[model samples]
Target: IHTSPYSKDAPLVASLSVNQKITGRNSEKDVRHIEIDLGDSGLRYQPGDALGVWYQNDPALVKELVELLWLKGDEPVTVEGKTLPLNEALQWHFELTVNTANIVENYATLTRSETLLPLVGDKAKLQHYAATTPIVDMVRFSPAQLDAEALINLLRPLTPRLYSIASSQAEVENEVHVTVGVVRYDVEGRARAGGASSFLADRVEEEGEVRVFIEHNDNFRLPANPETPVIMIGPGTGIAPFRAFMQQRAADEAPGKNWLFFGNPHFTEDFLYQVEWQRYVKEGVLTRIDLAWSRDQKEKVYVQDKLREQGAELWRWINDGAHIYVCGDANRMAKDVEQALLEVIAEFGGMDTEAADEFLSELRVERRYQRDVY
Candidate 1:
């Protein structure tokens, strides 16, 4: 196991408690502003760091999963050679949500699920089911009569979730803040929730301890020269790190031009931290704020759209030695924004697509264009 000050066995580790609800109830999505005290823990973090939180499975879900497996909650189970009660194992040790092929095979064989057995032989088919179906959902439909030990052997260990730190240590004393987008979905008429997001946003009570450690991101850091200009492009929960970056810049009173491009589904309901950004703009902390409300109009407009609209200015910023940062959904937003950036470079820098690609490569090598997507 890799060992460090932030490791699970570290001596001076800390825990965070939900300080307050920073969001209103009228919003469509439940985006939480979570603050946790780090008083006297000696656990320090930088502007672009992430906090790793260890949250136990919801007990209600645990009980349902336990019953679905046809195992008594009190049965003793062993994991990594450590014996623990079935309820404890389900709650704190094993991953009970996602379905895996090996786990499916074991459970299918136990229940003599002929339909499921055939699926076990096909890797692609098993993968499709595993991707779409939760383990509890499988147990509910496949009708398994599982021994507690068999279930324990099939389940994987629970893993910690990481959130980008949203507040600067210099500005917020003895506290760490993260903006969490609660994940809730429906799977075949059943309710599903993301393990950690739901824990922090809805389940964890105020002033309750949540085990966490600082995960320092060396690649995503502020420009060493405080005077270097910065342009940040983020949408949705992607805005988390930039908030930290701006907070750090403001706290240091850095003589740097700061520009932000933010996008979301709506303006009135989904504009996260609108008041703060407005204040920053009024105080000249934020040199510019470009917003894209995608669903507010008939046509969908994104951050990339805004980037292209201001392509000339963006190119000028690049020419003036500005560092660019992009953060958001990796699959879509990051890719779209990169394309827009390349198009701008091609158009304004008087280069073809291939040459623009080469210029972008150079920017990466020089560590000018950075991304923290997904």
Candidate 2:
């Protein structure tokens, strides 16, 4: 039985050994392959597990907040019963990028700004404003004089972010890997980045210490039978866990066929781990590989489209007891993949919609269909 003493509250402090950009220069997104050294922490993580990372806020933004709020930076503030300097609290404890509705409401109450009070009264408008606005911008819109305690009380606490494991322990030994897509966008001409993604991608340098813990997920495990074929459908950064799966299978020398359906915007620029997948294909470990470069052609094609194109063969694989896994965006990708599976089942099995629904439900109940979407 493998066990670890590390957890969310008491995470292991590990060092980042590698931080390499996986995408090409022409790629629109910045995706990094990050490797963290486990050292002697003895953290045991399986292929389907996730890594929880605690990241500090950007000091630049923290300093801007301090200046904008007119604080002297040495003011005392309490966070979770621990007293610290206001600047330190902002840097390590509070969320600065995301503006919550509660924060806006509190700000509205504090400032009694005529502009904000009306927006806060309408729930839909308030929700949209909070979702689209950054904390700094929100404050800029209605700047107010407040003390350190009031400032800290208005912000949300910094929370850990989770990324799917991208390397098997058998392959990487004491190191763990994850695929992080740095989120960058502009809010009113100012650059905004995701807290954890930016932390892993740019802010944290090689050999820098990162607080981490393993989050075990038994529900997304591979089949007990080594010979059972597997189908993986992952697009973009969703490819993380499937990489771990392939590494583990290769290490075990499992004689099961592996089929991968992957999609991204551009083939030449966005084919993540292209060399590795090609090597796997050449080695015959990858039984089948399908690519959907959405922007390569005039008509945009996705992994769901590829799944439909290979519906007959997919149905055959399912009949052969293949375990299917889909990992990606929950909002659209997962939903579209589910719909594609239903259509394939109905078309290939010559069944009606109701029968197709029942078949998919059966697959879920039998643990043949699994998803680790976010």
Candidate 3:
């Protein structure tokens, strides 16, 4: 009974057309240098900000799910303000992870998946969760055990993944760029994949139209003063948004110091945007560049390693008013990097553990330390 805020007559808020084009071919992974045309859009942004992109599921995955369920794609369906067939509804709306107990009960009436009833009934397991479990693992029963009505109700809808945009529109004029690590993995005898990253890297064409919406992030932004120095910690795909920050600062001719810590598997094959970083370093836009290639060494050196190696200089930067930024993997790298920074602060600043912890906590509360992780 209500209308969405994004309506037709709302001035068509200025945005960009994210055009993805692959730059590296013959690499182990299908990587793309996505270029977005922001047009005459007056959308203002600060450094250390992330752009969120709304992504749709791949047509192939959708078709595969339908085929596996023996679904009649033409079944009439209606929900919200729209009325369409079952296939269309699923393609744009309902989630597929609904394969849990409640959905199975609804399905049990239509089908015979009585075997899976115990999984949903397991109070301890469903109440307390662990890693992100695959929907396929939950719905172990085949089509022979469930009818079409029950099976359709058990699936979940697709969602979006946000990427740290690598290029500032101010620096590149009307262009926006993003660096993404294509996510592909095999899990429990089945291949699992990312919905958005894979589509951007492989399926879409250079000029093909893609439906997208932008979400501006406020937590991750540049310092208020133009001259405040920046220390960035980002390895692999995490370094994307910081590139945009430095590019914007450089283009503005801002007298701000820039230090970057980047890491990956190997220096030769995994050093992403190597040429661009070198170019920036030579131009003096990027003052210092640090590397921590993990797989190249026996001990798996990461950005945290580089932080410890130059403890005093890093502590000096902090004392001289440098804002710290961390981007990339959140699960482990971010936590490890924080611990390394704390240890450095305690060692170099000649402070107790509690004092050093308080210092970092104050920095975060004052918005001096920022994170742009997924």
- Per-candidate Cα RMSD to the true structure, in Å, reads 2.6, 1.3, 4.6
Greater-TM-score candidate between 1 and 2? 2
- Runs in model 1 with CA error above 4 Å? 1-5, 9-27, 100-106, 123-125
After the best TM-score superposition of candidate 3, give how far the Cα of residue 84 lies from its true spot, in angstroms.
1.6
Taking all chains together, the TM-score of candidate 1 against the true structure is 0.93
TM-scores for all candidates: the values are 0.93, 0.97, 0.83
The lDDT of each candidate is 0.83, 0.89, 0.68
Candidate 2 per-residue C-alpha lDDT over 1-374 given as tens digits, one digit per residue, 9 for 90 to 100: 67668899999999999999999998999999999999987899988899999998887888777888888668988888988999888877888878877778888888786779987667788888899888887777777788889888888889899999999999999999999999888777888888888888778655688999998898888887789999999999999999998898888889899999999999999999999999888887888999999999999999999999999999999999999999989999999999999999999999969999999999999999999999
Return the clash pairs for model 1, or none.
none
Q: Which digits, one per residue and each the tens of the lDDT, describe model 3 over residues 330-371? A: 999999999999999999999969999999999999888889
Ranking by lDDT: 2, 1, 3
Sort every candidate by TM-score, greatest first: 2, 1, 3
lDDT of 1 by residue, 22-109 (tens): 4456566778888888878667788888888887788888888877766767899887888889999988887876677777776777
The whole-model C-alpha lDDT of candidate 2 against the native structure comes to: 0.89
What's model 3's TM-score?
Answer: 0.83
